[PDB]
């Protein structure tokens, strides 16, 4: 099966309150496994999955140094963006980075990522070719020229093709017990009364891993979604996920509606009725 290593890094300026917030979290697939948090008691790169607790001090020390390096350059980047956009020094702004790698069953690289956002909007992204950049506006075009001239894509490509993939394999061995699992959804339809003409049918999917899932309602074979309510997939807190989808259906014709569930752990999809 395919797998992903991803880091999500957030810096937030807080003028008049002190130095920016800086937090980095790392995920293997849908499982978080590390963090660095500037606002912690003793900010340090540290495990957030039990199968990471056996890595030695050299791992945490080197990773801590790398996070602290980024903390410094995110501070600089926040100031530079403020200058690029000619913004007040008084307001709070956000700078985000996501990077990492997707690998296929053969565990070679399917896609490498290095992309950035300013105040929650695309700023600059390394393209799938790991050679060129997509700039989101003319400020980011300035960055693009600087990073092209500096040869940044080659630097990142070397990480993405080598280190990123090789450490992803190590993580997948360290967590072989829990990371390679597939928990199929336990699904059911629940009835609740609504109107006097209509009724709510809620299709539940529970306890599944990975998070990717498809829930759809259909009425006698075709499809329903333009008023079907569909909540975001949510963590249970125990490493599994939950989701539901509901339709309003007039009374007596509940039998007419089916919920369909698609998930990796389901050889064939589920068709469910109340």
């Amino acid at each position: 099966g395919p797998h992903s290593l991803r880091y999500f890094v957030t810096a937030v300026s807080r003028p008049g309150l002190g130095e920016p917030r800086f937090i980095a979290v790392g995920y293997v697939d849908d499982t978080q496994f590390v963090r660095f948090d500037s606002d912690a008691d003793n900010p340090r790169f540290e495990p957030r999955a039990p199968w990471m607790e056996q890595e030695g001090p050299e791992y945490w020390e080197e990773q801590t140094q790398r996070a602290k390096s980024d903390e410094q350059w995110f501070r600089v980047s926040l100031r530079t963006a403020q200058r690029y956009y000619n913004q007040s020094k008084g307001g709070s702004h956000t700078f985000q980075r996501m990077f990492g790698c997707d690998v296929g069953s053969d565990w070679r690289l399917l896609r490498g990522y290095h992309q950035f956002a300013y105040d929650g909007r695309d700023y600059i992204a390394l393209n799938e070719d790991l050679k060129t950049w997509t700039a989101a506006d003319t400020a980011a075009l300035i960055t693009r020229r600087k990073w092209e001239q500096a040869g940044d894509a080659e630097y990142y490509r070397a990480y993405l093709e080598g280190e990123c993939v090789e450490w992803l394999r190590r993580y997948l061995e360290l967590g072989n017990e829990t990371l390679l699992r597939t928990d199929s959804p336990k699904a059911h339809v629940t009835y609740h009364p609504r109107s006097q003409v209509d009724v709510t049918l809620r299709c539940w999917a529970l306890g599944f891993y990975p998070a990717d899932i498809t829930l759809t309602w259909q009425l006698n074979g075709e499809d329903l979604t333009q008023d079907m309510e569909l909540v975001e997939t949510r963590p249970a807190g125990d490493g599994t996920f939950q989701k539901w989808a509901a339709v309003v259906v007039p009374l007596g014709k509940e039998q007419n509606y089916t919920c369909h569930v698609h998930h990796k752990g389901l050889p064939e999809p589920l068709t469910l009725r109340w």
């Binding site: 880091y7 980095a24 790392g26 590390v34 660095f36 790169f45 990773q63 790398r66 996070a67 390096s69 980024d70 350059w73 600089v76 980047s77 530079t80 963006a81 690029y84 980075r97 990077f99 950035f116 700023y123 600059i124 980011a140 960055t143 600087k146 500096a150 940044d152 630097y155 990480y159 280190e163 990123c164 450490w167």
Partner: peptide, 9 residues
Amino acid sequence: YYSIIPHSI
């Protein structure tokens, strides 16, 4: 494995 950016935007 975390990897750094080398400089500013």
